[PDB]
Design an enzyme around this catalytic site. Structure first.
Site, short mmCIF file in Angstrom:
data_model
loop_
_atom_site.label_atom_id
_atom_site.label_comp_id
_atom_site.label_asym_id
_atom_site.label_seq_id
_atom_site.Cartn_x
_atom_site.Cartn_y
_atom_site.Cartn_z
CD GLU A 56 -3.02 -0.58 0.17
OE1 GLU A 56 -3.16 -0.44 -1.07
OE2 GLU A 56 -3.40 -1.56 0.81
CG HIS A 57 -0.34 4.94 0.35
ND1 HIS A 57 -0.84 6.08 -0.24
CD2 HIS A 57 -1.33 4.44 1.13
CE1 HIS A 57 -2.08 6.27 0.17
NE2 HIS A 57 -2.40 5.29 1.05
N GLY A 70 -17.42 3.90 -3.87
CA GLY A 70 -16.48 4.60 -2.98
C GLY A 70 -16.30 3.94 -1.61
N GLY A 106 -13.93 1.54 -1.12
CA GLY A 106 -12.48 1.27 -1.02
C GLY A 106 -12.01 0.05 -1.80
CG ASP A 108 -7.01 1.02 -7.36
OD1 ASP A 108 -6.21 0.26 -6.74
OD2 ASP A 108 -7.62 1.99 -6.82
CE1 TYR A 139 -3.26 8.98 -4.72
CE2 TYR A 139 -3.78 7.21 -3.16
CZ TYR A 139 -3.22 7.63 -4.36
OH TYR A 139 -2.64 6.71 -5.18
O1 LIG Z 1 -18.04 10.31 -4.34
C1 LIG Z 1 -17.08 9.57 -4.46
C2 LIG Z 1 -15.79 9.85 -3.69
C3 LIG Z 1 -14.58 9.13 -4.28
C4 LIG Z 1 -14.79 7.64 -4.54
C5 LIG Z 1 -15.99 7.47 -5.51
C6 LIG Z 1 -17.18 8.37 -5.39
C7 LIG Z 1 -18.49 8.10 -6.17
C8 LIG Z 1 -18.65 9.00 -7.43
C9 LIG Z 1 -19.95 8.97 -8.26
C10 LIG Z 1 -21.22 8.91 -7.38
C11 LIG Z 1 -21.07 7.83 -6.29
C12 LIG Z 1 -19.82 7.94 -5.40
N1 LIG Z 1 -18.39 6.98 -7.13
C13 LIG Z 1 -17.18 6.16 -7.23
N2 LIG Z 1 -17.04 5.07 -8.15
C14 LIG Z 1 -18.09 4.62 -9.00
N3 LIG Z 1 -18.06 3.42 -9.59
C15 LIG Z 1 -19.21 3.24 -10.30
C16 LIG Z 1 -19.69 2.14 -11.08
C17 LIG Z 1 -20.95 2.20 -11.69
C18 LIG Z 1 -21.74 3.35 -11.54
C19 LIG Z 1 -21.28 4.42 -10.75
C20 LIG Z 1 -19.98 4.37 -10.12
O2 LIG Z 1 -19.25 5.25 -9.30
N4 LIG Z 1 -16.02 6.42 -6.44
O1 LIG Z 2 -1.95 1.75 -2.21
C1 LIG Z 2 -2.81 2.87 -2.04
C2 LIG Z 2 -3.79 2.86 -3.19
O2 LIG Z 2 -4.75 3.87 -2.97
C3 LIG Z 2 -5.78 3.76 -3.92
O3 LIG Z 2 -6.84 4.61 -3.52
C4 LIG Z 2 -5.20 4.24 -5.24
O4 LIG Z 2 -6.20 4.31 -6.24
C5 LIG Z 2 -4.10 3.28 -5.65
O5 LIG Z 2 -3.47 3.78 -6.83
C6 LIG Z 2 -3.09 3.09 -4.53
O6 LIG Z 2 -2.22 4.21 -4.41
#
Ligand SMILES: O=C1CCCC2=C1C1(CCCCC1)N=C(Nc1nc3ccccc3o1)N2
Ligand SMILES: OC[C@H]1O[C@@H](O)[C@H](O)[C@@H](O)[C@H]1O
Length: 390
Positions: free
Chosen positions: A41-42, A134, A136, A184, A234
């Site tokens: 990680e990181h 979102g 993780g 990722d 980050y």
């Molecule tokens: O708000 C954040 C903060 C950062 C992490 C992150 C989000 C949100 C962004 C869009 C609205 C919901 C939350 N979405 C994702 N990923 C994502 N994967 C998807 C696959 C299918 C459809 C929709 C998808 O949104 N990651």
């Molecule tokens: O290992 C920490 C990880 O953090 C994730 O959120 C990022 O998308 C990866 O690229 C990696 O840096």
């Protein structure tokens, strides 16, 4: 109890929604998975070693090309911000795609914008996922790689697997304001059933490492918390890492070992020194963990996982009380080899390596010890991005 996953159920859902939405059966289906990082990680943005595996949690795009040069999108994913539908013309030399609302479409817009091959036609797509948004496990990388995989069918690229990871990564940087490493996107593309993927983020060499002993399980625990720092801190970590590399005249922290770091302590901030000690240590642990995993030495693997967490908690300071309490609970359960936070930190998920038969007992005990509300996935190592002609 562990939350169940699906695949053809997602394709059928995708398919029914598309038929309803666009008055026609979709021509094309793709899938791309989310991921758990077992260790490392990181390190990816430090040209380090990472050891992710692809999950059965995935994004599925079902679509067809259009002749009219516009893109029409539906998502049925809940947690997706309003509206669930978006249409936009393809970008040109004159007019590029812009990030905005809804935020879920920014991932698709970014991949379209940086797609390296022409001519890209318009298309209609339905987007579904089982990757918690979102939470993780790289929902966004799964959406980007599924999108990329869909565009390849509309207009084949001539390039490498890394080039495709880099496009998806550029979308993340430019369209979602998250300056991630390749891990990722690389695992979403490269995953194989029954394997973790050792990624050398300097050389971009990859090796499939076996991980499908039925006496072994990977338990993902979602804290169901995300502090704002996950987003804001980050990019701060990447800059502090660059600052230390720069001070020591190193291309990257991959080139730096604890001995050289220890000797340049005067040359670097107290915090700078702590971030570098984690990365240099974490790269070593990942090579040790790969060597351990090959031998079937899960006890050693688990120990290295605990060392990675302690390092992330104390030196990288990207844990939070939620993750720490989740790791404390896990390491108290008989048959648990090791537990640590996975991915970016400041919330999200822990990964626990344990004897399969311990999972029921660990889930009960983690929940009872967790001051919030935990969610559980029992994850086999899954395939990366796939295509099915409909
Ligand atoms: O708000 C954040 C903060 C950062 C992490 C992150 C989000 C949100 C962004 C869009 C609205 C919901 C939350 N979405 C994702 N990923 C994502 N994967 C998807 C696959 C299918 C459809 C929709 C998808 O949104 N990651
Ligand atoms: O290992 C920490 C990880 O953090 C994730 O959120 C990022 O998308 C990866 O690229 C990696 O840096």
């Amino acid at each position: 109890a562990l939350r169940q996953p699906q695949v053809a159920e997602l394709l059928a859902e995708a398919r029914r929604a598309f038929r309803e939405e666009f008055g026609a059966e979709p021509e094309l289906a793709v899938s791309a998975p989310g991921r758990v990082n077992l260790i490392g990680e990181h390190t990816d943005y430090n040209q380090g070693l990472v050891l992710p595996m692809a999950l059965e949690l995935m994004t599925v795009l079902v679509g067809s090309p259009r002749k009219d040069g516009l893109v029409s999108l539906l998502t049925t994913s809940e947690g997706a911000d309003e509206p669930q539908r978006l249409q936009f013309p393809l970008p040109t030399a004159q007019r590029s795609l812009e990030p905005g609302t809804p935020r879920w479409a920014n991932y698709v817009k970014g991949v379209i914008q940086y797609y390296p091959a022409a001519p890209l036609p318009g298309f209609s797509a339905v987007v579904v996922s089982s990757v918690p948004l979102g939470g993780g496990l790289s929902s966004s990388a799964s959406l980007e790689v599924a999108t990329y995989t869909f565009l390849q069918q509309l207009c084949p690229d001539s390039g490498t697997i890394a080039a495709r990871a880099q496009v998806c990564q550029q979308a993340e940087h430019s369209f979602a304001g998250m300056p991630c490493g390749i891990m990722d996107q690389f695992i979403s593309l490269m995953g194989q059933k029954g394997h973790a993927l050792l990624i050398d983020c300097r050389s971009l060499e990859t090796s499939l490492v076996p991980l499908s002993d039925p006496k072994l399980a990977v338990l993902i625990t979602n804290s169901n918390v995300r502090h704002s720092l996950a987003s804001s801190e980050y990019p701060v970590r990447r800059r502090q890492c660059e600052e230390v590399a720069r001070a020591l005249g190193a291309a990257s922290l991959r080139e730096v070992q604890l001995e050289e770091l220890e000797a340049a302590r005067d040359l670097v901030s107290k915090e700078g020194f702590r971030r570098a000690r984690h990365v240099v240590g974490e790269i070593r642990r990942t090579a040790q963990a790969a060597a351990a995993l090959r031998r079937g030495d899960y006890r050693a693997f688990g120990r290295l996982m605990v060392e990675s967490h302690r390092s992330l908690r104390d030196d990288y300071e990207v844990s939070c009380p939620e993750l720490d309490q989740l790791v404390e609970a896990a390491l108290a359960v008989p048959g648990v080899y090791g537990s640590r936070m996975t991915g970016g930190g400041f919330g999200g998920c822990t990964v626990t390596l344990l004897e399969a038969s311990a999972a029921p007992h660990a889930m009960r005990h983690i929940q009872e010890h967790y001051g919030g509300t935990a969610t559980f996935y029992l994850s086999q190592a899954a395939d990366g991005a796939k295509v099915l002609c409909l």
